[PDB]
Amino acid sequence: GSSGSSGKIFTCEYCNKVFKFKHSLQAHLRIHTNEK
Ligand SMILES: [Zn+2]
């Protein structure tokens, strides 16, 4: 079909940051979470 028919991007509702893959974001949320 197309090289990028659907270019879904993961956005962070914490710092309004976008990523390439899901994990990329999930891992980032680490710095967002508190009470480590
Ligand atoms: Zn964030």
From Swiss-Prot:
Zinc finger (C2H2-type) stretch: 10-32
Signal peptide per UniProt: none
Disulfide bonding pattern of the chain: none
Annotated compartments: Nucleus; Cytoplasm, Cytosol
Binding site for Zn(2+) 1: C12, C15, H28, H32
Reported tissue expression: Isoform 1 is strongly expressed in placenta, spleen, kidney, testis and peripheral blood leukocytes. Expressed in CD4+ and CD8+ T-cells, CD19+ B-cells and CB14+ monocytes. Isoform 3 is strongly expressed in placenta, ovary, tonsil, CD19+ B-cells and CD14+ monocytes.
Transmembrane residue ranges: none
Function: May be involved in transcriptional regulation. Overexpression causes down-regulation of a number of genes involved in the immune response. Some genes are also up-regulated.
Name of the protein described by the UniProt record: Zinc finger protein ZFAT
The organism's taxonomic lineage, starting at the top: Eukaryota, Metazoa, Chordata, Craniata, Vertebrata
